[PDB]
Amino acid sequence: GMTEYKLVVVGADGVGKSALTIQLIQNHFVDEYDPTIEDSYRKQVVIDGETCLLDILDTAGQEEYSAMRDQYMRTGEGFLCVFAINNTKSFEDIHHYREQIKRVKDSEDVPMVLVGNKSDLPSRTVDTKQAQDLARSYGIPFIETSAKTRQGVDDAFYTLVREIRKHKEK
Ligand SMILES: C[C@H](Oc1ccnc(-c2noc([C@@]3(C)CCCc4sc(N)c(C#N)c43)n2)n1)[C@@H]1CCC[N@H+]1C
Ligand SMILES: Nc1nc2c(ncn2[C@@H]2O[C@H](COP(=O)(O)OP(=O)(O)O)[C@@H](O)[C@H]2O)c(=O)[nH]1
Ligand SMILES: [Mg+2]
């Protein structure tokens, strides 16, 4: 049967979670998508020759640590932790998102990719080296993306699928 991969996109308001998700789903840059909409979206894709079904949860809205929200996030098999390369605060938030993922998955080994979005913009404030080194501290991949130009979009989601596969095979 066709394997389905449940991917969750997390990170600060405004980093481009929805834009990245919609590039994957629609193959179009959407520069405006209601920042409060949290929803999931499926797409069939071929990854290393295997046709699979991606189910992407684009997170949004208020921070809340209820049993219900934990349960919803726990359905994710892998997580994209997204910051914007022109927003230092969004990068400094990453460790909090990673810590909450570890907690809800009750695992130190959750499939995860660090994503530096908005790579098309010249106003960089987070060095690539610092981001690469954070990914190295966590032992996870780092992908540079632009939802505007589609740079890195497949790389981010497909790498996360590969990380889920690796984890399932252990
Ligand atoms: C960086 C923070 O800000 C925000 C703002 C919005 N969201 C968060 C946030 N952290 O983790 C999560 C997710 C969605 C991630 C996946 C796993 C779980 S499990 C659960 N219950 C979740 C929730 N709500 C989450 N989201 N953090 C700073 C610093 C602390 C206070 N704050 C001002
Ligand atoms: N230049 C540029 N703008 C982006 C990119 N991704 C998102 N944006 C803009 O960043 C803002 C927030 O994007 P959005 O997808 O709503 O982020 P979310 O809150 O993380 O879902 C909007 O003004 C988008 O047009 C990108 O890669 N490049
Ligand atoms: Mg959004």
- 4-169: CATH topology is Rossmann fold (3.40.50)
Running DSSP on this structure, what letter comes out for residue 57?
A: E
What resolution does the deposited structure have, in angstroms?
1.1
DSSP string, 117-161: E-TT-S---S-HHHHHHHHHHHT--EEE--TTT-TTHHHHHHHHH
Among the listed residues 87, 57, 61, the one whose alpha carbon sits nearest the alpha carbon of residue 73: 57
Domain ranges of the chain: 4-169
**Sheet strands side by side (includes 4-10):** 39-47, 50-58, 4-10, 78-84, 112-117, 142-144
Among the listed residues 43, 48, 39, 16, the one whose alpha carbon sits nearest the alpha carbon of residue 29: 16
Cα distance between residue 88 and residue 147, in whole Å: 18
Q: Where are the beta strands (DSSP E) in the chain?
A: 4-10, 39-47, 50-58, 78-84, 112-117, 142-144
Compute CA 116 distance to the chain's CA centroid, rounded to the nearest angstrom.
10
Using only C-alpha atoms, what is the Rg of the chain? 15
Q: Which ligand is nearest to the CA of 152?
A: 2
**Could you report how far apart the first and last alpha carbons of the chain are, in Å?**
21
Cα distance between residue 169 and residue 120, in whole Å: 36
Q: Experimentally, how was this structure solved?
A: X-ray
Give me ligand 2 centre to Cα 169, in Å.
35
Enter the tokens of residue 118: 């908005």
| Pocket lining for ligand 1, CB < 6 angstroms | 10, 59, 63-65, 69-70, 73, 93, 96-97, 100-101, 104
Give me ligand 2 centre to Cα 132, in Å.
21
Running DSSP on this structure, what letter comes out for residue 77?
A: S
Enter the tokens of residue 64: 């809340």
Give me ligand 1 centre to Cα 57, in Å.
14
Identify whether the C-beta of residue 56 lies closer than 8 Å to the C-beta of residue 25: yes
Nearest protein Cα to ligand 1, atom 30:
96
Identify whether the C-beta of residue 41 lies closer than 8 Å to the C-beta of residue 5: no
- Indicate the residue type of 94: I
Cα distance between residue 60 and residue 9, in whole Å: 9
Nearest protein Cα to ligand 2, atom 3:
118
Cα distance between residue 156 and residue 44, in whole Å: 16
Identify whether the C-beta of residue 88 lies closer than 8 Å to the C-beta of residue 126: yes
Enter the tokens of residue 130: 């610092």
